[PDB]
Design a protein around this ligand. Sequence first.
Ligand SMILES: NCc1ccc(S(=O)(=O)N2CCC(NC(=O)c3cc(C4CC4)on3)CC2)cc1
Ligand SMILES: C[S@@+](CC[C@H](N)C(=O)[O-])C[C@H]1O[C@@H](n2cnc3c(N)ncnc32)[C@H](O)[C@@H]1O
Ligand SMILES: [Mg+2]
Ligand SMILES: [Mg+2]
Ligand SMILES: [Zn+2]
Ligand SMILES: [Zn+2]
Ligand SMILES: [Zn+2]
Length: 423
Amino acid sequence: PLKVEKFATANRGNGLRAVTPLRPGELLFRSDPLAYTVCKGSRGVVCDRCLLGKKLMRCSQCRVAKYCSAKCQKKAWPDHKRECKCLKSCRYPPDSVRLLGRVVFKLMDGAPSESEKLYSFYDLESNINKLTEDKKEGLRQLVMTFQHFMREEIQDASQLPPAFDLFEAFAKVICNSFTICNAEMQEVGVGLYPSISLLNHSCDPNCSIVFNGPHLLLRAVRDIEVGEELTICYLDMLMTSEERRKQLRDQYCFECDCFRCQTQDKDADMLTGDEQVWKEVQESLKKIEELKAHWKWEQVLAMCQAIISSNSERLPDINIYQLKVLDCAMDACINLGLLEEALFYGTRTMEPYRIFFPGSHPVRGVQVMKVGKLQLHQGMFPQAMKNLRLAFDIMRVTHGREHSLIEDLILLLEECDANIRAS
Ligand SMILES: NCc1ccc(S(=O)(=O)N2CCC(NC(=O)c3cc(C4CC4)on3)CC2)cc1
Ligand SMILES: C[S@@+](CC[C@H](N)C(=O)[O-])C[C@H]1O[C@@H](n2cnc3c(N)ncnc32)[C@H](O)[C@@H]1O
Ligand SMILES: [Mg+2]
Ligand SMILES: [Mg+2]
Ligand SMILES: [Zn+2]
Ligand SMILES: [Zn+2]
Ligand SMILES: [Zn+2]
């Protein structure tokens, strides 16, 4: 019996609303993707199928798809078989083109997907009548890129779903793509989850999604009344209202009416410090984030240290650009085994994260868990326990028992508690 239902909103198209009262942490829907792929930077770093990092085995035919195990390579074959001949034949396509290829193959060759239970690819919003000419030109180039990439497998409309229009399909992709994140909150893939696509956006949402490999869990993060619309935040929380406005216009074709956008909620705190410094850090973050997307941790760390410990002027840790640098440095340190330095950066992020991730947000839950884990392994048992319990309080809501990371957290809590009891 579903706790959610599709409905027609007054001014935001279709949406999802609660059928029953919902409490924080309640699992509302779970879904595998209709189609998904690894993102360009994680290609060859994580398994194409399960999206875990490993030391990967490549598909011998295309040598593009890479896998953690024979199980994953073999299980991925039915959904990889047709794209394999295309990847071989061609130059690597934009993620959206690889994704749409997988959409087409799934719709043509696969049984009806549970991911389409509430809403299908065919139903998705295209926003075509809101696209500006520059966006239409970009979509036309994507169409032509798809036609080139897919030519070994799709030569005519007979090989697309009935009356499938590639321009419209890419228009849907742009406003319906989910960024799949691994357990550590590294972006690793992109997917379409058409039932989940019913959720409209809020900058202060009542639900949240989290990924466990390709699998998506939708949970309430506030109390929700019968009939109330369910929302998620499509965006990183570490964004000003101007940045949100740009992304919601450019990618989603809407103007956000939430209270936060009307009042520039938190913008001024997010932009504290000297503007010339944070403008330079924001510019450096383009390169830092590009390096991070490719798992280049040593280079990430070097760039971050040059900011965090700059000889030149510095930023407060609440400035969002400084905060993003701290977080990249922490993750680089964790992945590099520099656990004392990781804890220094991670600890600094804790109060800004408390402010910018109000309520229960999976990114804060994960960050607090990382900090608690670092403290636990440094023997700081009471401090680790407070953070691990805080992470559990958040992650019971945002992740829940169905997400494997919660089991890892429970292990840390038991280890930490055992230490405290032996002290
Ligand atoms: N610095 C890395 C980072 C990792 C994780 C997050 S997150 O967990 O907060 N989060 C991921 C999911 C994303 N949302 C989507 O991709 C998305 C797409 C849509 C609908 C289909 C348009 O709804 N959510 C919104 C940000 C933020 C930054
Ligand atoms: C993932 S879909 C959400 C479901 C969509 N309303 C539909 O009818 O299919 C994203 C699109 O929904 C609309 N949208 C989402 N959140 C909105 C909001 N807060 N205000 C207005 N439109 C919104 C925009 O058209 C956006 O591109
Ligand atoms: Mg429509
Ligand atoms: Mg419309
Ligand atoms: Zn795998
Ligand atoms: Zn292959
Ligand atoms: Zn808003």
